[PDB]
Design a protein around this nucleic acid. Structure first.
Ligand SMILES: [K+]
Ligand SMILES: [Mg+2]
Ligand SMILES: [Mg+2]
Ligand SMILES: [Mg+2]
Ligand SMILES: [Mg+2]
Ligand SMILES: [Mg+2]
Lengths: 58, 51, 109, 39, 45, 161
RNA sequence: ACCACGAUCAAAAGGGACAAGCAUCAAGCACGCAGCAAUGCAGCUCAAAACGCUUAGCCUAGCCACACCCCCACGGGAAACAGCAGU
């Protein structure tokens, strides 16, 4: 995703989390305590990732 | 629906966080009462010495 | 179609507030080094219209593109303040925090 | 060097090659001014 | 002999500095230097 | 301002019946007959009571900043008299830099306490320079001329319009 | 289309991206912002390389630039093959 702006923040809150800003103006919050990196990847793929059908169409 | 599911997941994780924090609070209260008793004894000793 | 500004939504840190109704913001993106294949931060400065002068140096802000530039370098406006400097509210729990410690316990509410 | 140092310095910059007596040309025309011998 | 060369270089250096300063206000549109300006001799004790 | 010399020592303020003792005992247990460190301790607790939310917590960043401020004042008082004490000059400068770092951390973490500390201790927080380059004579003169030329051009532009 | 509805193609304008060497080129010198304007603030770029000098057509279904010179061409130098063949 070369055109998506990724920024990181350290030790600003007691809990880790991800936030996604959408073009419409919506924000998506994903809490990631107790979750492995693989679980986080699967969660973000499910909620905001293109499915295999769309990729195959592309 | 995906956004709603994400919000529900956040709520479930929040419930688990609250439960864990309550466990932490009980163990805290215990050790903190112990330490407060120790400090009460220390203050008693210091006050007696100064008197 | 909604704007002629390239960067529609960006997140940055306010690095200057010496202009009237304008905040100078630092935006970092991750750029791949072609040789080392490691990602490094690349910085860019943006001027954001801040009508109310609520921005303080060091706070993390979200900028939304203006439909058209209002000045030579002012192409964005302050959509919101993501993290006020030293007054961070934890989004997961909603409670004030100072770094990694809660100022107000989540259990209190 | 560290990866940060390699990134900041960037790719190695080979100095430009030195031009020889022919100035990078196969041959050169010339006019003889004098002939002699050397040891 | 190194001396006279060295002060000659200092004089040319001062002239170059003054020329750059003059270029500034000439390009700015001012016909003369700013009112009350005098280029200091910064390369001589 | 220093505490009055009649103030009782920090360790002899909450002892019961300290008001019912002879005037000589009060003198013996006052700041008048102690070293400077007891006066500094009294200053420290006064600042803690006046500023911090919980005066008993000494591990907090604001409490540490108050302690370092009291120590910096003590070093400054020492150095007014011993102008040629280099070790204490070093200690004063290091303490000031450390307090600046602590103030930066407090500002980044707790802004309300940062403001309350800055008001209570009279500290004027300053931002660091952006560029660290030598300002030699040529640059200084050129910058002064450029400022002057900009001023003259602004006057000319305003008048001409 | 030819009534445009609108497609295709593509200028000018706005936003973004975009070669190499030299830091013995480290400061640029008005390079910003706000207001309907009057005017007000003093700002803007830069060691994460600004500013400058030098080198080079480029990212090749092709593209860019130039078209005797004075960047341009009212005007001036002056009388033009960097179209083909040829000298
Ligand atoms: K030309
Ligand atoms: Mg165009
Ligand atoms: Mg060429
Ligand atoms: Mg010709
Ligand atoms: Mg021409
Ligand atoms: Mg020909």
């Amino acid at each position: 995703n070369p055109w998506v702006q990724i920024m990181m923040f350290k030790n600003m809150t007691p809990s880790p989390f991800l936030r996604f800003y959408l073009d419409s103006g919506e924000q998506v919050l994903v809490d990631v305590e107790t979750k492995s990196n693989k679980e986080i990847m699967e969660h973000i793929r499910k909620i905001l990732g293109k499915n295999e059908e769309t990729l195959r169409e592309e | 629906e995906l956004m709603a599911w994400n919000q529900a997941e956040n709520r479930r994780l929040h419930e688990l966080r609250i439960a864990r924090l309550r466990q932490e609070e009980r163990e805290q209260e215990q050790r903190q009462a112990l330490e407060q008793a120790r400090k009460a004894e220390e203050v008693q000793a210091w006050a007696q010495r100064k008197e | 179609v909604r704007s002629s500004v390239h960067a529609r939504w960006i997140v940055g840190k306010v690095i200057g507030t010496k202009m009237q109704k304008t905040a100078k913001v630092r935006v970092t993106r991750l750029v791949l080094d072609p040789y080392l294949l490691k990602y490094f931060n690349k910085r860019k400065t943006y001027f954001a219209h801040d009508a109310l002068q609520q921005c303080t140096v060091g706070d993390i802000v979200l900028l939304r593109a203006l439909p058209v530039p209002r000045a030579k370098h002012v192409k964005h406006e302050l959509a919101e303040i993501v993290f006020k400097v030293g007054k961070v509210i934890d989004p997961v729990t909603g409670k004030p925090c100072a770094g990694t410690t809660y100022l107000e316990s989540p259990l209190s509410s | 060097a560290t990866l940060n140092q390699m990134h900041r310095l960037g790719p190695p910059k080979r100095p430009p090659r030195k031009l020889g007596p022919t100035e990078g040309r196969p041959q050169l025309k010339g006019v003889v001014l004098c002939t002699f011998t050397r040891k | 002999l190194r001396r006279k060369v060295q002060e000659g270089r200092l004089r040319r250096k001062q002239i170059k500095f003054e020329k750059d300063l003059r270029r500034i206000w000439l390009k700015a549109g001012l016909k003369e230097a700013p009112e009350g300006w005098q280029t200091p001799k910064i390369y001589l004790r | 301002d220093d505490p009055p010399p009649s103030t009782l020592l920090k360790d002899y303020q909450n002892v019961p019946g300290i008001e019912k003792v002879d005037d000589v005992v009060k003198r013996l247990l006052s700041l008048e007959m102690a070293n400077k460190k007891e006066m500094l301790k009294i200053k420290q607790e006064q600042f803690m009571k006046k500023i911090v939310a919980n005066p008993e917590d000494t591990r907090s960043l604001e409490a540490r900043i108050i302690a370092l401020s009291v120590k910096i004042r003590s070093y400054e008082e020492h150095l007014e008299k011993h102008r040629k004490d280099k070790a204490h000059k070093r200690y004063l400068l290091m303490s000031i830099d450390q307090r600046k770092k602590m103030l930066k951390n407090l500002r980044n973490t707790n802004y309300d306490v940062f403001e309350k500390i800055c008001w209570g201790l009279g500290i004027e927080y300053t931002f660091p320079p952006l560029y660290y380059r030598r300002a030699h004579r040529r640059f200084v003169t050129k910058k002064a001329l450029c400022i002057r030329v900009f001023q003259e051009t602004q006057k000319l532009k305003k008048r001409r319009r």
